[model samples]
Target: MGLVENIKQFNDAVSSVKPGDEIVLANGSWNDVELVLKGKGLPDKPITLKAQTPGKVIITGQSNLAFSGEYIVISGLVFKDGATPTGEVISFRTSNEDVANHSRVTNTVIDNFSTDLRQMSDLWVAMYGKHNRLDHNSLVNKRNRGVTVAVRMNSEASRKNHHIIEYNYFGPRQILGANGGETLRIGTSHFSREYSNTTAQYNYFDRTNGEHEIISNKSSGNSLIKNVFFETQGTLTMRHGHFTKVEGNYFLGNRKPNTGGIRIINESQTVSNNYMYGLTGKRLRGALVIMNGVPNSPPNRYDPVIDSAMNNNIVIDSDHIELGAGADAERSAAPSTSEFKGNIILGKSNLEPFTLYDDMSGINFEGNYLNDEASTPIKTGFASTPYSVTTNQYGLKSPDKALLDEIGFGEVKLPVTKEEVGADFYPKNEALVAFQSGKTIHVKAGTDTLTSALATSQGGDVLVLENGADYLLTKFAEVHHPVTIMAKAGKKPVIRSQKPNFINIENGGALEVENLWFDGAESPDYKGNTIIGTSGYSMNINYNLSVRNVKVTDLDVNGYFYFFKANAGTFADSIEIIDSEFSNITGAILQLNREVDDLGVYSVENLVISGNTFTNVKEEVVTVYRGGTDESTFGPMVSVTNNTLTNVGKGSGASMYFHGVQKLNISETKWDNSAPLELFLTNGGPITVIDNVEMKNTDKIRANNDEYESSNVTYD
Candidate 1:
C-alpha cells in the first residue's frame, strides 16, 4: 500500500506494485495529467488505483487516463471543467496491442467534461477489452457531438468482449441539432455482424436529448435490461444489429414532447416486457417503430427486418405505434416474417393505436389487445378488450392480474428512483436548468464594450447597453451561451458593424436582442450580410433568436442582405420577431432556407412574426422554405399575424413565400403596394388558416396546391 503525492511518484509506485497492492492519489487538483497504469495481477488479488477522497481528486484541463493490464480497478475520480486533449477521456487500452482484461472502472464522475467547439467529437469512456465493468459512474452534461460511452468492436479480441455497463447515470445532453449524438453506442456499422455480448442494465437516462437515437445498438447479442429512460427525447434504437434483447425497461415520458420508447430494425431482435407511458414522439421516434429498409442493402446500410419478435410490451397514453416507418422511394422494403404478440395498448379515445405506412401482410399478430375505447387504423391485429390498470409504489402502471392472465404476461419490474442508480456521490437533482437566473451585468456608455461583457457572462445573465450609445464591431460578435442583450429603456443604442454581420449565434447559443437599433448607413464598410446570422460552423446545433422592439434602417446601402439569416445544416427551435420595425431593406426580413435537401431537412421548427411593420423591402419580406415531401417530421409551424406592410416586394416574387410548411396561421394583417402571397405545398396537408386580411394594390393569394385555396381569407 502506498500514497502517491505527485505524478512521478504515482508512476514509480505503479511500476513496482504487486498483487493486492493499492495506490491512492493525494487529495487535490491534478491538472493536465496523462495517467497511464500498466501492470498485471491475479484475478483474486487485483492492483487498484483510487482517490484519497471520492470526488475530491479532481482531474481538470486536458487530462485523460489509459490502463492496460489484467485484473485492474480505477475508482473514485472526478473529471470536470476540462476536455480530453485527444480522442477519449478514458480508455481501456494503453495502445492498440495492449488492453486491460478483467478490469473495472467504478465510482467515477465525468461532469460536463466537453469541448467548447461543438463539432469536435470525443468519447467519455471507451471500452475495448474483455470482461470489463463500468458501474456506479455519473456521466452528465456532455455538450458536444459524440457518444458518451462506446464499445469498440474493431478487432477480433474486442468482439465478444462481454462488457457489463450497469447503474450509470447518463444525464441531460442538450439537443445537438444533428446526428451522432448517441448516449451509448455499441460497435459501429462496420461491426454490426460481429457479436459484442455487452450487457447494459439498471442504468438511468434522464433528458438525454441529443438526437433521435439515445442508445444506438449496432452490435449483435447485446442485452439492455431494467433501464429507466426518464423524459428522454430519443429511443432505444436497435439501429443495425441482430439477436439483441431489450427487456424490462421503463420509458416515462412525463408528457414531454418528442419522447420516445423503442425503435426496432435489423433481424432476429427481441423486444419484450417494456413499459411505455405518456410518450408523444411520432414517425421514426414513435412509441414503437418497425422501420422499412432498403432492398439488398450493403453491410453499412439499412438491412431489412426479418424474423423479429415483439412480445409482452405495454404502452399507455402514448403517441403512434408505427409499422413500416421511414418508407419512401429508396426505403421501400417493409418488415417481413415478424411477430407482434401479447402486447397491450391503452391510448386516448380520439387517437388510433397504430399508424401504418406500408403493407402489413408479412407480420404475424397474435393475442394483442387494445383498450375498448381505442380505435385502430388497420382491421386486423388488435382485439378490443376492456382492461384496468393499477399503479405501483414507484409510479409505474401495470395491467391487472386478470388482464395479465388473459394476455399471458408477467409483471414489469424496473428501477424508478435515483437512489437505485448512478454514483452515490453525484447529486440526483443536477439536471440542466432551462434558464439560469443570474445577476445583471451592465456596460457603461464609454468604459465597457458588449463583447467584453459577454466574455464574462453566464447563462440567463442580462447585459444592458447604455442608452443613446454606439457599439461598433469590426467582426461578428459571437454568442455561445444564453444571454439577453438589450438597451436601456430611455433611448435605443445603435449597433453598427463594420463587417458584414453584427452578431453570430454559435452552437448551444441563444440570443435575445431587444430595444436596439441597427444603422448600416453609419458604417461605410457594411455592404451586405445578415444583421444577425447563425454561425457557419455551427451545423449541428439548435439555436433560439428573438428580436423585439428593434429597428433596422438603410441595411442595403451597398449590397443586399437579410435581416436574419440561418446557415446551412443549422436548425432553430424557435424564432420570434415581435413589435419590430424595418425600413429600406434590400433583401428579405427573414431568410430560413439554407438546408435545401429533399430528405425533409429544414432550418426552423416554430416561427412567429407578429406586431411588426415593414416598408420598402426590395424582396420578399419573409421566405420560409422546406424542400421535400417527406412527412415523417412535423415542423416549420408558422404564425404571421397583426403586421403592416407598405411598399414591399419590388421584385416579381411573392411578398411572403412559404414552401412545404406543415401548419400555418396568417391572420389580422394589412398589406399595401406589396406582392401577392404564395403557398407551395407538396404534402397535401398544412391545415392552413388565413383570415381577417386586408390588401390594397396586391393580388389574391397564389397556391400551387388546393389545400391553401380552401382557407378562409377576407380580402379587401
Candidate 2:
C-alpha cells in the first residue's frame, strides 16, 4: 500500500507488477488520470489492486479514465464525471484471448460527473473473456448506464464466453444520492454476436434510468443471479436469449405504478430462481417481472437478447409482480422447454399471480408454494395467501415468493441445498401435487371468487396454465381430460353445480380433484357432472378417474352425487378409490352393473379400494357390475382395505356387495357397531378384513367367506 500523490505515478510504478502481487490505490481525487493494467495473471493468483481508503478516488471529465489492460484486480474506488459517454468508460481496445476481459472490480464505484451543463453518459464495456468476476462494487450517478459487459463476436476480433459479476452496489449518482439511472447494458452488433455465458450476481442498483435497467444483446447463455435493484426508474427488460439462469436475488424498493417501469427477463432465455417484492410506483415496478416477446417466432437459437424463457422465480407480492403470457409464442419465438418450478409465491390483493397472454413452447410448473393471500389466487394467480409484504429480516422472496414456497412437494421439510432464486432453481414438478391437491370444496378459506378451474379444452396438461395463475373451478363440469385446478392454501376452491352428480365424466376423462368443496345444492339430477362410465369414456385410457380428499356436500340433498366419476372403461375391475372420503353421498360407492354378462371380455382387471372413509350412506352404498355389455356373469376382481363405512342401508343395501363377482378381497374394512354386517351385505365373495373396528356392525363374524387380518377389533 503506497501513498502516491498522483495516479499517473502510481500507474507507472504498478505497470511492472507481477502475478500474486497486492497493490493498494491511495484514496484521493486522481483527476483525469488514465490508470491502465497491461497484461495477464494466473487464475490461481490474480494481480490485486485494493483501495487504501474507503471512498476517495475520484475521476472527472475524462472518457476511458481508468483503463485496466487485462487480468488485473482493481476495486474499492469511487469513479465519477465525464459528462458524456466517450464511447466506452472503461474498455479493452481489443479482445485478449490470454485473459478474461472481465478485469475484477470489487467494492469499487463508477458514476457520472454530470452537471447543469453536461449530461453524463457511460457507454459499453464491449469485450471478450471467460470466468471473470465483478463483486461488491457500487456504480452510482449513472446518467445513462452502469456497465455493459459483452462477449462472443461474429468477427475474428473477439471470442465471447463465460463471465461473472457479483455483489456490487449500483445506483443514481445524484450528488447526495438523490436519483439517477444506473443501468448495465449489453449492446448488439450486426454480425449477430455480443455477450453470452455471463453472470450478474448479488449486486445492488438504485434509480436506474433505463427503459430497462439490466438489458443484454442477442446471444445465448447469459444469467442474472442474485442481483438487486432498489429504485429503478426503468424496466429491467430482456429478449432473444436462452439458457440464462436467474436466481437468488432480492428486490426491495421499486417503482410501483409509474411510467416506463417493468422488471422483466423473458424472450428466449431462461428466467428462474429469483424473488421479488416491494416496488415503487412504476407500472413495471419491482419483483418477479416477465417480458414476453414476439408472436409465434421461436427466439434465435440460444442467442442472447433474443428471448428469456422465464421459470421458477417467486413473486410474493402480486401488487407489483407481473407474469407475462409468453407473448412471444404467437411469433413462434418461445423456447422449446422452459419451466417454472419450486416457487413459494404470494400476490397483491388487486392482481392474480399470472395472466395468459403468452404461451410457452413446452411450459412445465411443479412443486411451487403459493399463498393466495389476496383471496383472488386463481384469477390473479394469488389466492389463499394475502398480497402482503413482510420486511425487516431477509425475505425468502423478493416482492415474489421463491426461496420459501417452491419446494418439491414430497418432502415436507426444507431441502438441504438451497435452490437459486430465479428459473434455474425452480424444481421440476412432473406430478403437480399441489395443483392436484385443490380439487375439493373449502380447499382454502377466503372470500375470493376464485374457484377450481375446469378447463374444458386442454386438461391435465399443466403447462397450459402459466405460473402465477390461480385456477378455480366454479361450477359443475365433467372433465373430458386430465385438468388440474389449483390455488394457494387457505384459498380453497369452491365449485357450485346444480346437476344431480356435481361432476360427471364419460369420455374417458380422468380428473385430479383435491382441496375443493363441491356444493350440489342446486339440482338433484341423477346425471351429474361427476357421474362416470355411463357415456363410456376414459381419462385417456389406462388411468381410472380419481378424486381424493375432496369435500362433496350438496350430495346431502341429492343422492349419489360423486365428486369424481370416470367414463365407462373396458376394464371394469380397475375402478379404484385410494385414501379418500365419500361423505354424505346418498347412493352407490361405485355404480357398477350387477349383470355380469354386461361386462365384455375386458373384465375390470382390478378394483382396488384402499384407505377410504365412507360415512352417512343414505342408500345402498355398493353396487356391482350391472352394465349389460354381455361378457361375464361374474363381476370384476375387487380388493378393499382400511375403510370405514356407516349408516348403510340395513336389509337390501350393503356397505359392500359382490353381486355375482368372481373374486372379492377385503382387509381391515368394517361397518358401524349398531348396523349388522349381514344387514349391510346381500352377497360376499371371498372378503378379508384386518384390524376391524366398527360402530355399525356388532356380529362381524357373520361376514361370508371373510378372512380376518390384524387382532385390533372393537365393537363399540
Candidate 3:
C-alpha cells in the first residue's frame, strides 16, 4: 500500500503495483493528467487505484485515463469542469495491442466532461477486452456529439466480451442537435454482427435527450433489462445486430413530448415485459416501433427486420404503436415474420392505438388487448377489453387480476426509483428539470439585461421585459434552458439585435417570447439571417419555441431572412406562433424545409400558426415541408387557422407551401394579393380539414397531388 500526492509519484507507484496492492491518490486537483495503469493481478487479489476521499480527488482540464492488463480496479474519482484532451476520457485499453480483462471502474463521476467543439466526437468511457464492470458511476452533462459510453468489439478477443454496466446514473445529455448522441452504444456498424454479450441493468437514465436513440444497440446477444428511462426523448433502439433481449425496462415519459419507448429494427430480437407510460412520441419515437428497412442492405445500412418477437409488454397512455416505420423510398422493406403477442395497451378515448406505416401482412399479432375507449379499434389480433387500474408503490398502474388472467400473465414488475440506482456518493441533483410551475423574474428597462438575467436564471423561470423599451443585443443570445420572455402588459418591447445577431436556441432548449417586437431598423449593417434559429452545432435535437402576440417588422434586409429558422437535421417538438404579425420581411415566416432528402427526415412535430397576420413578405409566408414518400413518422401535424395574409410571397413561388405534411388542418384563412398557395401531398398521410379559406386577387391554389381539391375554398 502507498499514497501518492502528485502525478509523477502516482505514475511511478503504479508501475510497481503487485497483486493485493492498493495505491491511493491524495485529495487534490489533478489537472491535465494522463494516467496509464498497466498491471496484472489475480482474480481475488486485484490491484486497486482509488482516491483518498470519494469525490475529493478532482480530475480536470484535459485529462484522461487508460488501463490495461487483468484484474484491475479503479474507484472513487471525479472528472469535472473540463473537456477530454482526446477521443476518450477513459478507456479499458492503453493501446490497441494492450487491453484490459476482468477490470472494474466504480463509484466515479464524470460531470460536464465534454469537448469545446460541438461537432467533435468523444466518449466518456470506452470498454474493451472481456468481463469489465462499470457500476455506480454518474455521467452527466455530455453536451457534445458522441456516445457517453461505448463497447468496442473490433478484435477477436473483444468479440463476445461479457461486460456489465449497471446501477449507473446517466444524467441530462442535453441535445447534441445531431446524431452520435447515444448514452450507451455497443459495437459499431463494422462489427455489428459480432456478439458482445453485454448486460446493462438497473441504470437510471434521466433526460438523455440527445438524439433519437438513447441506447443504440449495434451488436448481438446483448441484454438491456430493468433500466429506467425518465422523461427521455428517444428510444432504446435495436439499430443493428440480432438476437438481443430488452425486458423489464421502464419508460416513464410523464406526459413529456417526444418521449419514446423501444424500437425494434434488427433480426431475431426479443422485446418483452417492458412497462411504458405517458410517452407522447409517434413514428420513430413511438411506444413500440417496428421499423422498415432497406432491401438488400449492407452492413452499415439498414437491414431487414426479420423474425422478431414482442410479448407481454404494457403500454399506458402513450402515443402511437407504430409498425413498418420509416417506409421511405430507400427504406421500403417492412418487417417480416415478426410476432406481437400478449401486449396490453390502455389509453384515453381519443388516443389512436396503432399506426401502420406500410403493409404489415407479414407480421402476426395474437392475444393483444386494447382499451375499449380507443378511437380506432381493429380486430387484427386485438380484443377490446375494459378494465380498472390501481396505482402501485412506484406510481405505476396495476390492472385487475381478471385482466391479467385473461392475458395469461402474473403481476408486473415495478421499476425502481432514482434512489435505488446511481453512485451513492454523487448528488442526485444533476438531472435537468424541464420546467416548474411558478417563478417569475422581472427585468427592468435599463437596469437588467437579458443576458445577465438568463445567466442567473433556472429552467422554467419567466423573465418579464419592460414594455416600450429597446433591448439591444450585441451578441447572440443563446437559450440553453426553458424560459419565457414576455413584455409587461402595455406596449410591446423592442428587441433589436446587432448585425448577424440572433436568439440561438441550443439543443434541448426552449424559448417562449410573448408580446414583444423584433425590429432590425437600427442595425443598418444587418443583411439577413434568422431572428431566431438553432446554433446548428449538432443535429436532431428536440427544442420548443413559442411566440405569442409578437410582432416582427422593419427587417427588410438584402439577403434571405426568416422569422424563425430550423437548420437541417434539427427537430422541434412544438412551434407555436399564434396571434403574431410579420411585416416587411424578406423570407419565410417559419422555414423548416432544410432537410430535403427522401429519408423521411422532418423538422417539427406539432406546429401551430394560428391567428397570425403577414404583410409585405417577399417569400413564402410559411413553409413546413417533409421530403420523400416515407410513411414512417407522424407530423408536422400543422394547424394554420385564422390567419390573414396581404402581399406576401410576391415574387416567390407560393404564399404557403406544405409538402409531405401529415395531419394538416387549415381553416379560417384569408389571403389577398399573394402568390399561389401550394400543397404537395404526395405521401398520402392526411389532409384532415381544409375549409373556410378565401382568396382575393391572389393566384389560384395549386395542389400537385390534388388531395386538397375536395376541401372547401372560395376565390374572388
Candidate 4:
C-alpha cells in the first residue's frame, strides 16, 4: 500500500523489490504503469503481489509495446490499456529455478487498450518461465496475433511445463495471424531424457482462431479437461506427446473451415468422451487428427502412435444438399497404430460419419454405429465376432429429418428406443408441422391483444398466426428451451410490438421465429425497441435459440432494432434470424453487450444475422443509457455470418458492438455499398466482413483507424 494514486507509483514500488520480500498493492486506478520483477521468489516463501480489489484498478501501458516482469506472485488487479501495441504485453523471463517453481499470478484483467485495432505481430502473454500458475484472469481484446498465451523453453529442463491455467476467459481477440494464434502456446520440446511435463485443465478458452486453447509440441504428460471452448477456428495441436487425456469438453464450430480441434502428431494418445454440437464448413474434423511426425520414443513408428478410444459423442451437423458430412479427412499421411470404438457419431447430410485416408493396418473398431461409407471402413476389424453397426443420431424431429433419413438412415429411430434427444419434436412423420395448432393462444388482427409473457411450444406443434396481425406484448422468452416456431408454408405470421421488446430467460432458450413478420411503433426516444430489453447469459448451452426465414418490418413510430443489456447475448445459437426481411425501422438487429466485464459468462456464443433484407429504418438510441448504450456499446457474445441484404443502413444504430462479449465471427454478408455505412457494431471485438451477393451502398469494413477502437472489422 502506498500514497500513490496511479500505476506508476505501485509499479515503481514492485520493480525495486529484492528477491525475498512480499508486496501488497492498494486498489485504485493504477494508470499507465508497467511492473517488472527480475529475481526469483525463494522456495519457502515465494514473492507475492496482489491487488486490494478485483477490477477496481487499471494500468494503461505504452501502446504497441509489452511490459511485464517475472518472478513474483502478481494477483488481483484489473490491468488495462495493453494493446500489445508493439512486441508483446507480458513476458515471463526468469532464470532462478525457485522462481520457476512457486511464483504465481491470479484474478487479474490484462487486456488490450483499443477496441478493434490489432496489429498482426503483437503476441500477448507469453510465459517462458515454467511451473508458474496463471488463473482467474481475463486476457482479451487483442486484435492482432490472438496469441493470448505463448510459452517458450530452451531445453526439456528449461521447458516451462507443469503450469496451472484455469478459470480464465480468452476471446474477443482476433488472430489476424494466418498461422493461428494460441490462447496457450507451449513451445516444442527436444526428445531429451528430462523434458518438461505440462498440464492444462479447467480453463475456458472460448471463441479464438485455429490453433488456440492449448498448443504443445513438447514432451508427454499434458491434459485438457472439463474445459468449454466455443467458436474456435481450428485444432488444439499436440505433437510427439504421449499419455495425454482430453475429455469432458463441448466444442461447436458451425462454420469452421478446418478440422483442428485436437491435432495429434505422434504418440500413444487417448482421445475420449467429448461432445461436439455443430460442425459446418470445409474440413470439419473432430476429436483427433494424427499429424505427420516421428515421436521421441521410436519403434512406435510403424504404429499410428494412436491408441485412442472415443466414447459417446454427437458429431456432424450440415446444411448442404450434396456436400456430404463427417470426418473431413483421416489421419496424417503416415498414420498407423490407431483404434476406434464405443463412439456415437452423428452425421447430417448425404455424407458418411468417418473418413480414413491412411492405409496402415492393425486398427480395431467395435460397438459403433455407422451406415457411413467412409474410406472403405472395415466394420470393427478387431473382432472376428459380429459387431452390430447401425446409423446413429440424436434429438427431436428435425425439419429435414425425413429428408436426412431418406438419404442416410434406412429410417429414423434406429438402435435407440427414443424418438429424439435434443430438439423437442421428431421428423419421422414425414408430414411436417409448420404452423402450431395449440388450440389455446389465439392472436388475431384489428383488436389489440393484451401483453403478457410470450407463448411457449414444443417441437412438433405449430403456432399459426393470421397473416397480418399484431400481438401486443412487452416481453418475450422461451424459458423451456425449445426452437420450433415456423408458420404455414406460404402464410406469414406477424407480431407487432405494442410495447418495446423486453425479454429474459435465465439459462436462455431456443427459439425459431420464421415465416413471419414483426412490426412496432417507432420510439423517437430509445426505450421503445421491441427486443430483449433486459437480457443476460451464463453459458453456451443456456443461450440456445435460432431464428430463420423471418421478416421484421413496417413501423408507425421512429424505428426498431434489438437492444441488449446486462448479458452475454448469443444470436444464431439463441436467436439465428436468417432470411429475415427488415424494412422501414429505426435500429439494427444485433447480438450486443457493451459494459465492464462480469462473471459467470463467456462471450455470446454462435450468433448470426444472415440472409436478412433491410430497408429504411430509424433508431431512437435513448437519451440516457440505462446500461451502456443498451448494446452497440457493451457486453454480448455473438456473430453475424452469411446473410443477404439491401438498403440496410438508413434508420440508425451502430452496425454492431461488443462491450464485453468475446468473439464476433462475421463473414459473407455485405453491409454497405455506400457512405455512413449500413451497419454499426461499436465497442466490440474482431468482426469478419466479406462479399454480399445482394448488398447496397456501404463502405467496406474499417478497423480502429477511425476512432472506432471500441469495435474491430475485417473485410475480404
lDDT of 1 by residue, 1-716 (tens): 89988888988988877889999999999888889999887889999989999978999989999999889999999998789887999999898888988999999999878886656679999999899999989998787778999999988878899999999988888665445779999999998989999999999998988777889999999998889999998799998889999988999897787788899888888998888988988777889999888898777767778989888888987878989887778678899999898898877722675888899777888878888887876667778877476786555677766667776666655654557677777686654224336668887654227767777887778888888898777756788777788986878988887667778887667888899998785445444587888887644446888889999988776656779877776778789999999998887888775643334556777799999999988888888776665453454779999999898886557899888786788988888889888888766346578888887778888888666634446466
Q: Candidate 1: list runs displaced more than 4 Å.
A: 328-330, 386-392, 397-401, 408-413, 428-481, 484-509, 513-525, 528-543, 548-562, 565-572, 587-606, 610-613, 619-716
Encode model 4's per-residue lDDT on 608-702: one tens digit a residue: 56666555544321111112322111123345556544444434333433333333445555555322332334432223233233234544543
- Per-prediction TM-score, please? 0.83, 0.45, 0.84, 0.49
**Could you say which candidate leads in TM-score?**
3
In terms of lDDT, model 4 sits at: 0.45
Question: What TM-score does candidate 1 get on C-alpha atoms?
Answer: 0.83
lDDT (CA) per prediction: 0.82, 0.45, 0.82, 0.45
lDDT of 3 at 60: 94
The TM-score that candidate 2 achieves is 0.45
Candidate 4 C-alpha error for residue 253, in Å: 4.6
Report the lDDT of model 1 for residue 164.
99
- Total backbone collisions for each predicted model: 0, 189, 7, 82
Order of models, best TM-score first = 3, 1, 4, 2
